[PDB]
Design a protein around this ligand. Structure first.
Ligand SMILES: Nc1nc2c(ncn2[C@@H]2O[C@H](COP(=O)(O)OP(=O)(O)O)[C@@H](O)[C@H]2O)c(=O)[nH]1
Ligand SMILES: Nc1nc2c(ncn2[C@@H]2O[C@H](COP(=O)(O)OP(=O)(O)O)[C@@H](O)[C@H]2O)c(=O)[nH]1
Ligand SMILES: [Zn+2]
Ligand SMILES: [Zn+2]
Ligand SMILES: [Zn+2]
Ligand SMILES: [Zn+2]
Lengths: 174, 174
């Protein structure tokens, strides 16, 4: 048998404007997607037998013109860095978002690199192997996804929460 | 170092009308007490290094005339059975509340017996040793408390949440 309790994880979504952060959230939490306020959404799912309440934060679009404030990252245990596989610029900015996390987020936050818009294969600018190699180099989890076609969307969120739970537990047997 | 995450525990308060359930809640969550809606309150505190968000439920007084519905107990990991040390009847009803928990609450809910109104020592009807012996007999945690004078109030809630966390963890090394 198992006891009746929940884990509270705060996750933040970061990345350049237009990479599909808000559509990743609406696809995972409400299964909706829009071709071009709601501060965060919560979905609860089972991770290795345990119930995990994931509170996933999303921007209001201010990252297009200014830097995200420190309060956005506070309390977050995981983070998704989203880029556009069809936009090189959005992939080059991954280092900037890594700087943002080191500067305002928890020192041991668990990071996952997400390559969104995998449906635009005719416009692919960033090869999967380049970003996958970069993720392992910087000890980030990695997947490509498509909020439009729902490919690997649940995988991007389940992979991070599963790694958070296991990395926490593994850290607990000190 | 420790990761940034929380545990969500639902706790319910049960006992006969007038034993001091609502005043136990206001004393622990808001440090207020009244001499003779708000469905539940949440207070977060540190249990053995970890952060535990306790959601403590309280009745609207319907237990005076009818039985508490099943939905009140659903999801609860712990429960406080409160009686009046100055009212024998309220102590005799502890078996009824144990029946209520077996009937509508989780099969492995952790129960604590609380003897409230310890300040009315001139009116003591239930000796501490009788209820303490009864609690160990039925594998309940036990303390006396006074919502009026704040004695053992934080102890009654901290003792239960600490036992819940450790009993869960101890159950986890299957
Ligand atoms: N083709 C495609 N377009 C997407 C995808 N995800 C988002 N978009 C589009 O990208 C634009 C910006 O998306 P949005 O979620 O607002 O990006 P955000 O600024 O990071 O939140 C929208 O017009 C979406 O239609 C995807 O997986 N595939
Ligand atoms: N002397 C004393 N009176 C108390 C204590 N706790 C509650 N009361 C009184 O008992 C009455 C009923 O308390 P209440 O919290 O509403 O009981 P409930 O029905 O179980 O919620 C109130 O008038 C309180 O003033 C206590 O620790 N000591
Ligand atoms: Zn957005
Ligand atoms: Zn910054
Ligand atoms: Zn009450
Ligand atoms: Zn019943």
């Amino acid at each position: 048998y198992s006891y009746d309790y929940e884990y509270l994880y705060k996750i933040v979504l970061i990345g350049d404007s237009g990479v599909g952060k808000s559509n990743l959230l609406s696809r995972f939490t409400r299964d909706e997607f829009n071709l071009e306020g709601v501060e965060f959404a919560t979905r609860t799912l089972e991770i290795d037998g345990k119930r995990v309440k994931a509170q996933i934060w999303d921007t209001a679009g201010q990252e297009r013109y200014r830097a995200i404030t420190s309060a956005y990252y506070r309390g977050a245990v995981g983070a998704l860095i989203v880029y556009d596989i069809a936009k090189t610029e959005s992939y080059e900015s991954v280092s900037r978002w890594l700087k943002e996390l080191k500067e305002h987020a928890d020192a041991n936050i668990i990071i996952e690199l997400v390559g969104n818009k995998s449906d635009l294969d005719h416009l692919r600018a960033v090869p999967t192997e380049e970003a996958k190699n970069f993720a392992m180099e910087n000890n980030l989890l990695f997947t490509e996804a498509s909020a439009l076609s729902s490919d690997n969307v649940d995988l991007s969120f389940h992979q991070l929460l599963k790694n958070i739970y296991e990395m926490i537990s593994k850290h607990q047997l000190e």
